[PDB]
Design a protein around this nucleic acid. Structure first.
Lengths: 550, 405
RNA sequence: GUGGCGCCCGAACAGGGACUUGA
């Protein structure tokens, strides 16, 4: 290992910790001592007993594949002390970015971390002690380490960079400890370059087989299965339990969201509102008919098999949306019809009150983010919305909302504002001065309206602050009013809610507001202040203040 | 020959542990294509991941060019090392150029690339280009020399820039000069053609030392505020009066000489929002007082330099924008107007920031009416300058929009 | 025994909008 070893220091003005060894058994002891002998004669570990008074504890285990008591260690007292490194291996390589390459292969690594040495100004801090007892210190990168994957990938890239420049035609994707390698070349030359690569790496002391899974694939990869020209999730089922628990709910939710990225036409929303208030791990909740109809839908979708595709850089890619209602949004990505690359789900609630075009902008910008981080280019679009609506929205909106090149599709359902507002009042219409208040102590609010004719009104309410008071006030106004209307209030909250023009929201009263607002063909809205004596606004505020403002 | 200054952050100020937002391949290709050459000329250098600090990267294709240049978001670095250029090697700010007819911004980023830098400071300036789809980890690098987008490298470069500019401006006295960042300014209230002639002569004079230097042209002295004017329709509807009444009640905090008595007198008689209401002599007197007031500016505000600036912005419609500036709220300094959406926005922030540069010699803190992910994603394409402002995002009230129609 | 990523649920700080104690 003549590699370009790295200098590594410790945090500012600190020391290595000292701990006690744990109370353990007798059978694992000589076995892991033999493991230590094996790792030592492999040319890895330095044995030094009287070196320094450091004692990093040990947490051995009987791990999977019983009787293979592998070597293990704790480093929680040092990982907080080791100097930060950088980590760009945050996300994961999506199958889509993997390019269509015919001659594919793979080369895993055996005991990868145990082949790179470490810098002699740091081998002191690896006190692996065990029962007289005895100490043993690494010269290498051990596990439980904060900076081992970064150093590993850095040294691996700097090692194979000459191999890259020798054959840039060939693609090399790496990960934690694995090598996805491939090309579109013929097999006699593929295995030749691969053997040259093997000798290239074993020049630096690295492992690799020939009897691996090259024709044995599809692989299993973070829950994904990779055919050469296709791919799909690790195969999925769903439980047939007659009842449901919350663990059962979260299990299937995680499962289908791990399958939603390829499976079009999924619903989770009604299947996840159950968790609000559901916090115990034993509550037998029903399988309410919304969720029953949803999971029957989902199982119907899943009963058929499907496979994805890979990416070709030349053929420009397309996005599309098949909206399925109830504030939920799906999305397909395809370079050709019916050959979908990936799909997914988006039904987030940016603010409890919202409209559809806002959610659509949210969705397309998130899809642009994901398409950037996966492929590196935002796609051309195909959306179910007319241009005049987009023009009316961003002209009559108090923000900026851009989308890339796009076009129209005639795929029902459609997206459209179920109503609108005017910037100009009406002759022959009615005026409605409204207001409403409540108390912090009894919550027994009052609300009402008044006209210019005289047909006034007062209504009491309960268990609320003045915001929902004003909202129920305009509700009672619209219920007592007619066909067109011109309204005035004294709150910026109702205005900030309405002028966003929502078509769907959570609590039932704004739903009633919009439900009866759509009927009224025309409407104006305005705002005025209080404590100024502005016409009916004082009258109503006096009338509702009785029993409220004392 | 080189003897760099010992530079260091304020004690109790960590370095910039920052991520890197996503990038496109079309930019990454050019970024690699140019950083390799920068690395061959000894300007930068590869490293391992032994240092954790990072600083973002983003590409551009600016006006008056077609290349694929780059720059760096050094916002934290400047905010944390501001002591250096504030006391250690600082410079004063004049106030003569803003009253002059014409200026011309320059770009001298190449000269910075002929001077080394402190070795102890280089780890605080790591910049990662990413690799698509997390295939490969970042191709990390390190700055050996004084980089662009940082407000300490012109601070120490001013010393040799003084010896550079010595000869001509003793000859050419009436010109004022600034140096804020990689860009450079030149004050010239003279003929714009002669402005261009002397600009060409100066460019050649910089070329004499091997300096390559291939909005761009500006006219500040004619700028003024938009004095808030109001209609004069002899007819008035109650909607108009309510709107005006809320307008003045919100504006009271700005202008103390604000009275709405007679307008509130007309409202005790409730009626529709369409009848005519003749303004009395008293009420029209109050209007005339207000209109004579708003022709004037504020009296009582001043430019506190040691505080920070906040440059709020609003959208109106029709492709017409505004802007407001204040250190402390409701004490304005300059307002105005400026006519796809996001491109208008970056043009507007470029304009406003240049105005702030020439006037106060400082870049403000923004408050934009837009989401974070949208701007963070899309702003990288349409930008054309070589510096960065500080910004955040806001959830705009629909009454500040009633500032102007 | 430990760590990392995802999904869900809860506590602290800044901004904005509203109700009570004093000249």
């Amino acid at each position: 290992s003549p590699i370009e070893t790295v200098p590594v220091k410790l945090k500012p003005g600190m020391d290595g910790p000292k701990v006690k060894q744990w109370p353990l058994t007798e059978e694992k002891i000589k076995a892991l001592v033999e493991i230590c002998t094996e790792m030592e004669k492999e040319g890895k570990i330095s044995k030094i007993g009287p070196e320094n008074p450091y004692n990093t504890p040990v947490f051995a285990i009987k791990k999977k594949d019983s009787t293979k008591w592998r070597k293990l260690v704790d480093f929680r007292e040092l990982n907080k002390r080791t100097q930060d490194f950088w980590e760009v291996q945050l996300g994961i390589p999506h199958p889509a970015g993997l390019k269509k390459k015919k001659s594919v292969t793979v080369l895993d690594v055996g005991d990868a971390y145990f082949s790179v040495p470490l810098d002699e100004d740091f081998r002191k801090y690896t006190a692996f002690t065990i029962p007289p007892g005895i100490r043993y210190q690494y010269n290498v990168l051990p596990q439980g380490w904060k900076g081992s994957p970064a150093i590993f990938q850095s040294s691996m890239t700097k090692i194979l960079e000459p191999f890259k420049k020798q054959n840039p035609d060939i693609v090399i994707y790496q990960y934690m400890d694995d090598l996805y390698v491939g090309s579109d070349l013929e097999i006699g030359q593929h295995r030749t370059k691969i053997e040259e690569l093997r000798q290239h790496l074993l020049r630096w002391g690295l492992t690799t087989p020939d009897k691996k899974h090259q024709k044995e694939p599809p692989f299993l990869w973070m829950g994904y299965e990779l055919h050469p020209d296709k791919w799909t999730v690790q195969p999925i089922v769903l439980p047939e339990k007659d009842s449901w628990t919350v663990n059962d709910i979260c299990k299937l939710v995680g499962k289908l969201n791990w399958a939603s990225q390829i499976y079009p036409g999924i619903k989770v929303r009604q299947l996840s509102k159950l968790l609000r208030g559901t916090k115990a791990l034993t509550e037998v909740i029903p399988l309410t008919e919304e969720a029953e109809l949803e999971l029957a839908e989902n199982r119907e979708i899943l009963k058929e098999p499907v496979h994805g595709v890979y990416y070709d850089p030349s053929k420009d890619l397309i996005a599309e949306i098949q909206k399925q209602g109830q504030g939920q949004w799906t999305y397909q990505i395809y370079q050709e019809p019916f050959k979908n690359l990936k799909t997914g789900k988006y039904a987030r609630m940016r603010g409890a009150h919202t409209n559809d075009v806002k959610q659509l902008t949210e969705a397309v910008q998130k899809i642009t983010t994901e398409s950037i981080v996966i492929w590196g280019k935002t796609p051309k679009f195909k959306l179910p919305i007319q241009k005049e609506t987009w023009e009316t929205w961003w002209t009559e909106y108090w923000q900026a909302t851009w989308i890339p090149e796009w076009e129209f599709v005639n795929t029902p359902p459609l997206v459209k504002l179920w109503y609108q507002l005017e910037k100009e009042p009406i002759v022959g219409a009615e005026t409605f001065y409204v207001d409403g208040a409540a108390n912090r102590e009894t919550k027994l609010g009052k609300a009402g309206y008044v006209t210019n004719k005289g047909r006034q009104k007062v209504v009491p309410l309960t268990n609320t602050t003045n915001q929902k008071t004003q909202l129920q006030a305009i509700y009672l106004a619209l219920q007592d009013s007619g066909l067109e209307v011109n309204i005035v209030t004294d709150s910026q909250y109702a205005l900030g809610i309405i002028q966003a023009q929502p078509d769907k929201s959570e609590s039932e009263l704004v739903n009633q507001i919009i439900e009866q607002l759509i009927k009224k063909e025309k409407v104006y809205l305005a705002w005025v202040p209080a404590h100024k004596g502005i016409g009916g606004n004082e009258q109503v505020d006096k009338l509702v203040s009785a029993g409220i403002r004392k | 020959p080189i003897e760099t200054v010992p530079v260091k952050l304020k004690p109790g100020m960590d370095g910039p542990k920052v991520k890197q937002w996503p990038l496109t391949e079309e930019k990454i290709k050019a970024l690699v294509e140019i950083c390799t050459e920068m690395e061959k000329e000894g300007k930068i250098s590869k490293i391992g991941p032994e240092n954790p600090y990072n600083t973002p990267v983003f590409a551009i294709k600016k006006k008056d060019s077609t290349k694929w240049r780059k720059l760096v978001d050094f916002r934290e670095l400047n905010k944390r090392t501001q002591d250096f250029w504030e006391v250690q090697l600082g410079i004063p700010h004049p106030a003569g150029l803003k009253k002059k007819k014409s200026v011309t911004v320059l770009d001298v980023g190449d000269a910075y690339f002929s001077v080394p830098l402190d070795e102890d400071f280089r780890k605080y300036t790591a910049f990662t280009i990413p690799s698509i789809n997390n295939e490969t980890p970042g191709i990390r690098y390190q700055y050996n020399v004084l980089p662009q987008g940082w407000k300490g490298s012109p601070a120490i470069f001013q010393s040799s820039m003084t010896k550079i500019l010595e000869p001509f401006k003793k000859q050419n006295p009436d010109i004022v000069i600034y140096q804020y960042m990689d860009d450079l300014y030149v004050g010239s209230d003279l003929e714009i053609g002669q402005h261009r002639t002397k600009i060409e002569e100066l460019r050649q004079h910089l070329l004499r030392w091997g300096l390559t230097t291939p909005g761009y042209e500006l006219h500040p002295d004619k700028w003024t505020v938009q004095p808030i004017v109001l209609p004069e329709k002899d007819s008035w509807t109650v909607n108009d009066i309510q709107k005006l009444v809320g307008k003045l009640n919100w504006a009271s905090q700005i202008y103390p000489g604000i009275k709405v008595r007679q307008l509130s007198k007309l409202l005790r008689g409730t009626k529709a929002l369409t009848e005519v209401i003749p303004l009395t002599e008293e009420a029209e007197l109050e209007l005339a007082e207000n209109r004579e007031i708003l022709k004037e500016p504020v009296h009582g505000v001043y430019y506190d330099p040691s505080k920070d600036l906040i440059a709020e912005i609003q959208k109106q419609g029709q492709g017409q924008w505004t802007y407001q500036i204040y250190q402390e709220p409701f004490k304005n300094l300059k307002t105005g107007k400026y006519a796809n959406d996001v491109k208008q926005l970056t043009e507007a922030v470029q304009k406003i920031t240049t105005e702030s540069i020439v006037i106060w010699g400082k870049t403000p803190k923004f408050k934009l009416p837009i989401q974070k992910e949208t701007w963070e994603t899309w702003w990288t394409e349409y930008w054309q300058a070589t510096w960065i402002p500080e910004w955040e995002f806001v959830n705009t009230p629909p009454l500040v929009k009633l500032w102007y129609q």
